[PDB]
Design a protein around this ligand. Sequence first.
Ligand SMILES: [Cl-]
Ligand SMILES: [Cl-]
Lengths: 263, 263
Amino acid sequence: HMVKVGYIQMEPKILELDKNYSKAEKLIKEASKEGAKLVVLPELFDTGYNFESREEVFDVAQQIPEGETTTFLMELARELGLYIVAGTAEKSGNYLYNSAVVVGPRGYIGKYRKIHLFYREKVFFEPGDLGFKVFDIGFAKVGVMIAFDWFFPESARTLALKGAEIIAHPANLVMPYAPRAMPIRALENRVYTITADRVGEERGLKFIGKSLIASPKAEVLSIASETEEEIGVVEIDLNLARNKRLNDMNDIFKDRREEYYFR
Amino acid sequence: HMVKVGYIQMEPKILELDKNYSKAEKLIKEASKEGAKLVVLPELFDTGYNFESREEVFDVAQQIPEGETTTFLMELARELGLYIVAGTAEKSGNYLYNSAVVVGPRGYIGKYRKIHLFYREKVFFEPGDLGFKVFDIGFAKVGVMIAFDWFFPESARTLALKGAEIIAHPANLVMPYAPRAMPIRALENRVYTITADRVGEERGLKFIGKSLIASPKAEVLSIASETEEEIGVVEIDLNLARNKRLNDMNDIFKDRREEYYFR
Ligand SMILES: [Cl-]
Ligand SMILES: [Cl-]
């Protein structure tokens, strides 16, 4: 029930897939040496974010799972004996999705397509259509959401109600709020959250860094710099997430009264 | 559009209804002079909180709206021409509810019964059975929730989806979290929140104070001390709560995708 998990805070270079693979590899190898068994990369780590046209992203985006990003991550996950959740631009026929892939030693585990698109993403990407999924990685059940999904408390709630013990959260954050909000998402659901943000400025848009890992008690177990590429790895206690008792008398999920919600 | 609202942070003395009325009156008179048109009093401001048995509270609890607490609040609201949301122990036949009463210049408006009971409340009180209600007070729609209701993101979400522009939140807080959480509840629903907490130690139980008013942008507009009785009144812009645009391409409520939540 104790396991080491981490974020990889990196600076994707827009449209330079090979360079971004190399950077991810370097940092993930560092995280593996610290003992991480699950690592999370940022939203759109492979392509970058701040596109000018649909064409330029459509021309580089890879299919999941046959394409280059997924195959790269598979090789790395098997080499290092760990699980990776990573944000990537997904080409599916004529459509692009803002996706996250989950890989492990056995290969491709599954994917998530961003349900709540943010700002100009609606110009490039189709809204996600697979719902909120929880993946079994043996030592834990891991839910995935991407960036702006944090804003909707229903995102994490749905993952937690489906049995997520850890929420892996690839992100490219631009608003100042997520670092204050994510510990509340962790607290209200009694889960661990791993927000992996990028850094840098990209065609005029500044990302905020501040990747963080939050506990079921709203503790910030690790928080990154605003500007620097870095990893954060911490040991988490999965029993703290499986036990929904806030105190002796209140189990948070048994205390929900659905008949009074949304009505 | 622009209106002044406030919290009253007081220290109820357990079982001393008349003393608590006098204290509330004093502080609400101060809030009226500052221009408040809506004031929120703490959870169970009339009875206090940390009961030793159900009998002790059953013996002082008042009916709503015929009982002493509601009639007191009605007299005060008429005299000062304002709206009051206040936490009170409700006697309803043979049952006790941990309730909030809404009154205005013309009299009794309605009530709310705490849906999510916290810790030893379960020993004294029946779980609320009226659902989450929004009350029309002319210049605004006010939703009400009580104390531990904050922990469940569905509480504020249900109020906001029913049209709440302000969430009045009587509370007796003992955990450290709500002052960090309330701005996120405001932000995610684009509403104002007024958390009126008590202070003091009562039979060994310490309340945290820190009453606060939060904006749709997660700004703490006013926050009280840990220990002192005080008021806080601020001018809020109700158009910032009515307009759910986060930015020029994302409207928070139009961006919700219910088909993917809880399933
Ligand atoms: Cl953001
Ligand atoms: Cl609390």
